[PDB]
Write a protein that binds this ligand. Structure first.
Ligand SMILES: O=C(/C=C/c1ccc(-c2ccccc2)cc1)N[C@@H]1O[C@H](CO)[C@@H](O)[C@H](O)[C@H]1O
Ligand SMILES: O=C(/C=C/c1ccc(-c2ccccc2)cc1)N[C@@H]1O[C@H](CO)[C@@H](O)[C@H](O)[C@H]1O
Lengths: 810, 810
């Protein structure tokens, strides 16, 4: 049908058809009288997977022969979503499979909806890891992603009575056709025990053993025949473990296997729980044995020429002392040589500045669980502080500020300090964030070792986030400029020379309109909710946090409703305001915010005076597959974190590539997006970081804003008095109380400017031609935000390897 | 190579070769530079499995069209062993696969050794269920086996320092290529809760839900293209289950899933544990919903014309009140109609007379776990006792003896009484056992309803237990009489006309000798133990229990050793005495017996005066795959249970078919085996049941035997004084104490007769020609003990269906 979806050759279609039927018969053990749509999904997935395996085997054989430097990307999260369509896109099989399935009497899009998301992440950090694997394969890098195969990923969110309920994401129930278990590469991981000192060094003894069993998933590059590996570890008990007496010993195997059972869902709070520490060590210990095994199967001097380890946040920070443990205790290298190798091998990426998100593990936990690692960490700390003392003699406060060990009620290890000390490179994830790291939280470290600190601005993969989710847009672009932009996104700049082309203008606008009609239909079908597709689609989707300021959005919504009720017969640009995202199960304020959003909906959506001029919908169970549907349909992207709090953002980039305009603060990557597009083509408002700092020095007093802005006061009274919760008038007192007396994120301070900026958005939307021309200018300048650019910078400036765009042979 | 292994056609071999390579590449994702023998095993298994699926689908389609009466065989145990070779045998593929693998440079026998046993049973009862599925498929019956998919089967036994150690049988670690998960047929099972009475009957409410997920395994008939199904249920938690708070609720899913985690290993003790009761209900509740679903998908009057349920012991006895619950509570049939349907549908097989093996569940357990079932059981009991009262008025002791409810300290339900009341047929498993049921333990029930009581003498499948494990023997037989005996074992009688044929005599003896050389080699390779293959192979393999009298065997062994030490230069027929079997983890005396056997070995095997005239070996980890190796190699089968204690035995039959002579008591099926072969061709000794009864009336006094038999006294002194345990002289005091003062199984009373009978065995073994002629007479009369005869009798006399030997089309 559409050109970017590839060829539908007679030979190809015929062969796909017979392989589909083979799998249905031999693999699924069904015939067509009993097969359900789920059976048909699986037959398709196995058919497509078969096309991967030859390339997968020859890619890994290629790396064995050429022995390139290998990149190991360590992450506790890989937020992959669905795999079927992505695989078809990257292998150029989408149209052939569409034809083959059509001829079998089946609708491929319907089969695609059956696949479960691989929801092995919380949000931004997890999805970045996924985008990165796609780009590393596409750029021909010999890269491996290593993590944990959680039996249960991020919980499925149900809304009951306006409240979030969590249920288990049993994503493996029907089986996962993409993974291959590799029980033959199982490895032991040690916990607890104690340290003995001998003449021939330290020995870690009397440990409990848990086994790490790997499962490999293929990661295909875009049409280059490269297929890389994501290896996820699963926890297994040894067979003499514990060995009711007998029955109970068998049942207690669960204790060990609980390590890989569930993803921690609390993504900007740190909870120092033992089970999470076990997960962190488990991934690190198994991965490093795997790395070393592969290195020996080609003298540790050359280890950093053959190995790069990238730490995604501090979550795998124990790689540093584990590498030291292996090198010193097992391989018998002297300390200084081992340290040199470790530093040259490891690099650390930081993803936040909020102090409550930093990992600080209690010493008593490490002491019991990982006694040898604690000793190594103390030794690292001592030698590190000796260097600080020599560089800044007499500066005793610097010594206590830079220490890896934090003193206090409970002593803790600062894992961020450990990562800086033991890495040759440290990067933030957007320019403003990387500057903040150097100026504030890691200032002392930057003065000691300025050469370590870098920026690598985040990106997204244009395969999933344009070709896959928005084929209509990818096609009209391809018509004008060809297909090469899909792996070289900077070529979208050529679209500037069509900003005055009346045909293109009409087509960009038509694609958006079709995407919106499609999504409005999805809403009615799967959620019995009825929206006006001529309204402006105003969308804020991301995890629920106070710093992301969903509450500021809420205040605007209520202002609109109040203005309509005041002058009901005045014209306003109609809006559908959509907000979605998950709240961490323990985060009370985030749960109250969800309830507020649904409560506003209850009032606004049933007020006959409003009509269909304003609708407020809470988008349930936001996740990767829902993002792929809502983002192509959006007109306005809400990116409104308090300046200095969102390290980068990546949702922002998705919306820009897909033809929405952005209203946002000068925070994270928003700054670079506005710089690329031009500030005239962005709806920027609010305090900059400098303004927030000045307000903090003075003291933030929310009462001042309440006293001087009558529209704001009216909303606060409505919240307080039970306007949005008639049967429980005090339901939202916690929210009011927070806003009035302890708002760390200064919601009121940006209110006026935000409401004014929103009026300008509405004004532009009334002129469809100029809206669409501004959109073209955004899409055209979105090229910098491809993850291929990001990974190319990691490769050259951190890992010391050259990317390659050349096909491997098929 | 050998004819019974089928054709090796050029077309077949070529096609197997390419399918093997396909699976290695696409299924296992390997190439031949990295493949291990385990990879090659899996490629073979998938290749053979492909040949099943077409027949499996068309068999089940055939049953849908013809709608025959369906047989449901309910068992908590299915002791299947390995599947690969059995599948090849039954499909006539063994020689083709042997050729195909040879041409690929691989040894098929070596690949066969990689497969794990499916050890989902303890011993006799579990293996009977397995033999039965094979025979039901071979006889064209529309039969389904239903049980539990235990994650851990019977423990692997290691011997450390002469002691049994148990380790977990993690049989699914590498995956099971034979099963197909069917998550789409998942069913809810209810526990706990309470009963509400309404106007419209009782309702069971506030229950906890566990999900039952089925896994289907194919059961192929012998060369008839029938493939039946064994459906095993796996326990899964629902996704709102419980829903740390969040983390802990996810981890607590283990509680529900523990139902299918592990097989109870205690096979002639009853332990009233809650987890076992959950297993019993779980299998019954899921199975019955499945049965009813299938019945509706063609008025419950016709239910018993379309459904037979066979209860393998009392373990699935809750089928009776569950069927009543469904019919009365959910389908709204009146009680009397429901009861009629239930009785006509269910039949019960009893497997023992030992009182400590009978299931008697505490009322308080049923009360909490299954409150509605308890009510139904009380109601059944009340109506049943009203019938007893009417038939035997005034007989008040009969009323208390026959009651399903046992009074006492704790009230219990007698599940055997429940099964008799609710079944139209009750059978024992050998003639003597079935007579004992009528005369003693179920006398009262037989007087009330004599028509219910039947005999069905056990059997074994000649596919696994001759063709598969002893191809050499199957071939020399086939040469003389053709192949038809494999599915009509009575044809072995034709071998009587070769008892004087000198060629046949030499061939029978040569096959035994080759089997023995092969096993002696297996011993050295896998266990560093060196035996003389010219000795008589004296074998006792079965679970370790006092009633099976491994101790009597021990006493004989020590007598032989003592006679040699007394007259060392006298000639004796050399022996290798092999004893093997698992002890239940809690059964202290059984564990002491294993230690005694190894201790005797320690002394006997290293005494230079004995030389290689006597060896005592404990066969470690006895299980189905080990039986297949040792049984073909045996000369003498030890079947020496105290008369009246072994209900049937089936090991006995295996040895008879494979060319060993039997020394045994007149117990279980030994009686019928001697009757078939002729008592002159059997080494019978010891008390009969009548003699045991007379001794009990008088009072068994072991001291009398010790006082009158000097050779026995010497052994007891040796045990007592530390002869077999020098460093711990009192190690075996418990054993001596038991033998002298509370031996329920009268070991001393059969000692003299046993030792004398053993001398006659030795005398015959000195004349190789006459030994072999007696063997021929055993093999020739083993036909009655085919499980095809057994199942044909169940089919006609219990289930009301005709067996069929006709091929389905391929
Ligand atoms: O998603 C995250 C952080 C997730 C996270 C997840 C888990 C944990 C955690 C740590 C310890 C124990 C339990 C949970 C801590 C943090 N950060 C986002 O990373 C994106 C990619 O760089 C940025 O675009 C966002 O600005 C940043 O907030
Ligand atoms: O194997 C068994 C009994 C096994 C068994 C297994 C499990 C349990 C059990 C029951 C409740 C709770 C836990 C365990 C009770 C008994 N019996 C043998 O059955 C054979 C087949 O009929 C006969 O040949 C043997 O004579 C008989 O002992």
């Amino acid at each position: 049908q559409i050109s970017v979806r590839g060829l539908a050759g007679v030979e190809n279609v015929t062969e796909l058809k017979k392989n589909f039927n083979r799998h249905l018969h031999f693999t699924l053990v069904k015939d067509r009288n009993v097969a359900t749509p789920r059976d048909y999904y699986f037959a398709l997935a196995h058919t497509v997977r078969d096309h991967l395996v030859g390339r997968w085997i020859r890619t890994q054989q290629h790396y064995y022969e050429k022995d390139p430097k290998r990149i190991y990307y360590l992450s506790l999260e890989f937020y992959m979503g669905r795999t079927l369509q992505n695989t078809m896109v990257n292998l150029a099989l989408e149209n052939a499979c569409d034809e083959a399935t059509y001829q079998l009497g089946l609708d491929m899009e319907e089969l695609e909806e059956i696949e479960e998301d691989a929801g092995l992440g919380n949000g931004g950090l997890g999805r970045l890891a996924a985008c990165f694997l796609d780009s590393m394969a596409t750029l021909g890098l010999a890269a491996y992603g290593y993590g944990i195969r959680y039996e249960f990923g991020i919980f499925n969110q149900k809304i009951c009575g306006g409240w979030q309920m969590e249920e288990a994401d049993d994503w493996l129930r029907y089986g996962n056709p993409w993974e291959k278990a590799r029980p033959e590469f199982t490895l032991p991981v040690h916990f607890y025990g104690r340290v003995e000192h001998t003449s021939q060094g330290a020995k870690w003894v009397d440990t409990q053993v848990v086994l790490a069993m790997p499962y490999d998933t293929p990661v295909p590059g875009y049409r280059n025949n490269v297929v890389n590996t994501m290896r996820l570890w699963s926890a297994k008990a040894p067979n003499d473990f514990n060995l009711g007496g007998y029955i109970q010993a068998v049942l207690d195997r669960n204790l060990a296997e609980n390590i890989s059972r569930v993803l921690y869902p609390n993504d900007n709070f740190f909870e120092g729980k033992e089970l999470r520490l076990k997960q962190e060590y488990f991934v690190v210990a198994a991965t490093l044995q795997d790395i070393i095994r592969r290195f020996k199967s080609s003298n540790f001097d050359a280890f950093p020429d053959k190995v790069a380890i990238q730490l995604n946040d501090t979550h795998p920070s124990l790689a540093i002392p584990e590498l030291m443990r292996v090198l010193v205790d097992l391989e018998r290298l002297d300390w200084d040589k081992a340290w040199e190798v470790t530093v040259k091998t490891c690099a650390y990426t930081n993803h936040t500045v909020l102090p409550e998100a930093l990992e600080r593990w209690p010493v008593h936990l490490l002491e019991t669980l990982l006694p040898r690692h604690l000793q190594i960490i103390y030794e690292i700390n001592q030698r590190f502080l000796n260097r600080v003392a020599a560089a800044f003699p007499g500066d005793v406060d610097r010594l206590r500020r830079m220490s890896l060990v934090e003193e206090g009620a409970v002593k803790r290890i600062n894992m961020a300090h450990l990562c800086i000390a033991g890495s040759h490179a440290v990067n933030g994830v957007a320019r403003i964030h990387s500057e903040i790291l150097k100026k504030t939280i890691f200032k002392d470290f930057y003065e000691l070792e300025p050469h370590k600190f870098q920026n690598k601005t985040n990106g997204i993969t244009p395969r999933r986030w344009l070709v896959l989710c928005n084929p209509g847009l990818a096609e009209i672009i391809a018509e004008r400029i060809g297909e090469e932009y899909i792996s070289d996104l900077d070529q979208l700049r050529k679209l500037l020379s069509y900003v005055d082309d009346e045909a293109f203008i009409r087509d960009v606008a038509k694609v958006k309109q079709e995407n919106k009609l499609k999504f409005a239909a999805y809403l009615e079908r799967e959620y019995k909710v009825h929206i006006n597709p001529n309204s402006l689609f105003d969308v804020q989707v991301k995890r629920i946090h106070e710093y992301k300021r969903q509450l500021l959005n809420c205040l605007h919504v209520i202002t609109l409703y109040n203005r309509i009720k005041k002058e009901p017969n005045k014209f306003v640009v109609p809006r559908t305001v959509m907000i979605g995202g998950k709240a961490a199960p323990g985060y009370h304020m985030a749960k109250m915010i969800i309830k507020l959003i649904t409560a506003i909906g209850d009032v606004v959506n049933h007020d006959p005076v409003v009509g269909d001029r304003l609708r407020v919908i809470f988008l349930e169970n936001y996740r990767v597959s829902l993002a792929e549907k809502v983002i192509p349909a959006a007109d306005l992207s809400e990116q409104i974190s308090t300046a200095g709090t969102e390290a980068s953002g990546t949702g922002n980039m998705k919306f820009m590539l897909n033809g929405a305009l952005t209203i946002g603060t000068m925070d994270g990557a928003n700054v670079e997006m506005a710089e690329e597009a031009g500030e005239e083509n962005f709806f920027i408002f609010g305090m900059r970081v400098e303004d927030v700092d000045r307000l903090d020095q003075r003291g933030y007093n929310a009462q001042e804003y309440y006293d001087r802005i009558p529209e704001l006061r009216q909303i606060i009274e409505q919240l307080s008095s039970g306007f949005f919760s008639p049967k429980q008038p005090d339901l939202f007192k916690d929210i009011v109380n927070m806003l009035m007396h302890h708002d760390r994120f200064k919601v009121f301070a940006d209110y006026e400017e935000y409401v004014k900026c929103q009026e300008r958005v509405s004004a532009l939307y009334k002129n469809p031609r100029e809206w669409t021309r501004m959109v073209i200018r955004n899409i055209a300048t979105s090229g910098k935000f491809s993850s291929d650019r990001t990974i190319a910078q990691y490769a050259r400036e951190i890992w010391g390897v050259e990317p390659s765009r050349q096909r491997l042979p098929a």
